[model samples]
Target: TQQEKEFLESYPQNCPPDALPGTPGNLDSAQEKALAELRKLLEDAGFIERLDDSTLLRFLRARKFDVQLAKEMFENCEKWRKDYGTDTILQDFHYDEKPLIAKFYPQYYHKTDKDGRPVYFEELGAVNLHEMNKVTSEERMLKNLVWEYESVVQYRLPACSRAAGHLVETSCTIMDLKGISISSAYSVMSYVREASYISQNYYPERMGKFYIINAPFGFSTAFRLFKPFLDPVTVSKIFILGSSYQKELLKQIPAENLPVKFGGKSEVDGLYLSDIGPWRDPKYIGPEGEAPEAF
Candidate 1:
C-alpha cells in the first residue's frame, strides 16, 4: 500500500489508482463531498439555478441503484409534487412532462379470448403505472422492485401510470398458477423483459422505436436539453409504446434528425415519432444534407 501510495505521489498523472478507469476510489465519499462543495459554491455564485429533473434523472438513471442517486433524483423530482398552478417557477425553468404524466388503464385488468388453449387475460396488469395495495408486503415490494429493475434499471422505461397496474394483474396471475409467489418486482421485471425481447426480436421493423426521440436541444426551456449523446430514457419509451411497425421508422431516420411528436397525454406537448414509412422516402418527411431545424 505504501509503495502504491509513493508511486501515486510521484507519478500523479497516470499512476494514481483513482485515475484508472476501473478503479473505485475515483468516486469515493471524499471526492463526492468535494464535488458537492464546489457545486454549492458555484450555485451561490449564480453559476447554476437549481438543476432540472430531466438533467438529474438523466444523471441518476446512470448511477447504480445507489443511495446517492436515489436521494438526488427524488429531491429534484419534488419541484412540482404539490405545486398546482400554471404560474409556477417550473413553467419558466427546465422540466419533463413525461415524468409528471398519469395515465388511466382499466384495460390492463381485463381479458379477451382464444379457442381451446389457456384463456389469457386481455389486460396484463393495470395500465402501466396503476398503484394499488392489493398485494401482501412481500408481494408489493417484489412487484415494485421488479418494475424498477426492468423498466428503470435495465430498460430505462419511465414509470408510466399503467405499469403498476400491469404488474398487479401479472403478479396475481402468477400466484394463481404457481400458488407460491415470487416478488412482484421480479415478475413484473420479467414481464418487461419478455415484452422487450419480443418487441425487439419478433418485431424487426420496430427496432428504431427504442433508438430515437432524445433531441440535443429544445425550442423551449421546459423541454430539457440533452448533451451530445441521446437520452436512453426517451429512446426506451419509444420502444415500449411504439407499435412493432413503428420500430423500423426510427431506424430510417438517424439521431441527428431530431424527431418530434405531440399529443400522447392530455395536451402537455412532449416528444413523439410519427411514421411516414407508408408514404415516400424517409428523407421526404423532413429534409436531407447534414441536419435541419426540428419542427
Candidate 2:
C-alpha cells in the first residue's frame, strides 16, 4: 500500500506558493498520500510536463484518489494533447469569429461568484445548429473550446484565486434555457455531445456549481436524449430551477456580479465582453497567471 512518498521530493515549481491554492491547507493526509503515489508513478515514467501539485491534484480528485485510475486518466489526457496538437493550439489557435460565434452560441465567462470562482454563462437556447455552422466550423468550435479551457487554467481561475486570497479551483456555470425548444435542443445535441467529450474528459474536475435555469415543461424529455452524453463521473451538483432561480443564484453569486438580465447589475451585456472581473485587474493577476493575449 505504500507508493514511495516521492512526490514530496519535488515542491510545486510552476505556480507561486500561494497559488497552490489548496496545497498544505487543502490536502488531507490521505489525499496527500494519494497524490504522492500518483506523482511518483508519473515521475518514474518520466512524464513530467504538467506534473505540478495543482494539476496532479485535479486528476486524483477526478478519480477519487485512485492512483492507478488517475494515472490512466492523466496518460490519456497527455495522449490526447499529443494526438490533437494541443501544444499548437495553446500557441497559435485564434478564434477570429468571436462576434459571429457569440451571436449564435452565447458562451463566455463573466465576473466571479461570491466564492471568487469565475462566473461562466451560456444561453444554450440561443444556439441554432444552422446559425452556428454558418459562423463556425464543427472543428473550429472544438478548437475554440480547448483554447478557452487552457485560458481558464492559465489565467482566469488563477486570477480569481489571487483575488479571493485562496485557490479558486472550479467554476460557477449558468446554463440559461429561457428560449429553448424541442427543435433547438435536438439540433444543439450534436455539438453538445462533441463539446461534452472535451470538457468532461480532458478538463477533469473543473466544475464547482452548475445552475441551469428557465427549464420549461417537457424539458426532461429532450434531456433524456442528452443525458448519456454528459458523463456521470463528474460531481458538480447541478441546481435545476425554474424562472424563480434569481433567489437561488443570488445566494452564491452576489447581485452585483450577476448579469442585469438575470437580476443583477452587471452592465456586461451580450456583445463585446472579455475578461471582465479579477482577470482584468492587475491586482488579482499579480505577476503570475496571465497567458499572452487570450482576450
Candidate 3:
C-alpha cells in the first residue's frame, strides 16, 4: 500500500529495469528468497504455469487463431477461478461483469499451410463499456488504453510496417453508444502502429532505467484513475511501454500517486465503484496459499 511498495511491486521480478532499480524496496537476498518462495505459491495456485523456453513459438505454430487462443486461455483462467482461486475477502478479477470483445484479422488473410487452416489476421481486443456508461450517469469518457510490454500474453504478433498490414487495414471501429467524437479520424487513426504486437523475451540487463507507462489510446477523460489490464502472471503489462509513445507516463514517480492506466477502475458512470462496498469478499481456499513469486 505504500508508494515504495507499489512502485517496486510493479516491477517484473526477473527484469533489470533501469527506472525501477532498488524499487519495490530492492530485493535483498532474503527478500529475493522470500519472493522465490512466493512464486511457488503462484504455481501451486495455477495462476501461472511454467512453460518451456519456446512455448510462445510453439503455441503460435500450433494454433492458427487468436480467438482459439483466447477461448483456451479463458477456459484455463476459469479453471483457476473455479478451483484454486482464493475465497479470500479481498477484491479479485471478475470478467463476468466486464466483458470485452476482441477480434483477429491477419494481414493478408492468406490461407494456413497445406491444411485448410485459415490465415489469422492481426487481432484487436476492445471492451465496450457503452452499456455501463448509459446505465450510469458518469462524466468520465471510456477511452481505450493499451500497454505494449514484451511479454507473451499470446504468441508473437507483427512488429514491423510490412508485417503490421493487418493492424493497418483494421481500424478500431468504436460503436460509440455515447455519441462522442474526436476532431478528426485521420489524426486519431494515425495512432495505431504495426510493431507493438511482436513478441520478445526481455533480459534483466536490457531493461530501461524507469518503469515507463505509455498511453497508446490516450488518457481517459471520464475517470480519475484506472488499472491497466494485467496478464495472468499478474505482471504490469502497460507500465513497461517506452514513453516515446506518450510522455505523461514516463514523468510519473511513486511520489506522484498517479493512477495506473489499464487494470480496474473505481468508477461507473460518474460515481465511484468499490469492490468492498457491495460485493461479497471470499478468500481463495486454494492450497497454494499465495506463496509463489519466482515464476
Query: Model 3 over residues 140-243: C-alpha lDDT tens digits?
Result: 11111111121101111111111222211111111111122343322223233222111211111111122222323443322114443432222432233423
Tens-digit per-residue lDDT, 4-67, candidate 2: 2232221222323533233435776888888888889999987857776777888887777899
Q: For each candidate, what TM-score against the reference?
A: 0.18, 0.84, 0.22
Candidate 1 lDDT tens digits, 1-295 = 3543432232112113412221223455544553454445435545333232222222333344243654444343333222422123222322122122212111111111111011111222223333432222323333322232222211111111012111110110100111212344344564457555433322212121222222222211223333325455434323222223234433333322312221111121222211111112332111111111111
- Those runs of model 1 whose alpha carbons end farther than 4 Å from true positions after fitting are 1-62, 84-228, 231-295
Query: What TM value does model 2 have?
Result: 0.84
lDDT of each: 0.26, 0.75, 0.24
lDDT measured at residue 122 in model 1 versus the true structure, 0 to 100: 21
The model with the greatest TM-score is: 2
Clashing pairs in 2: none
Angstrom error at residue 247, model 1:
8.2
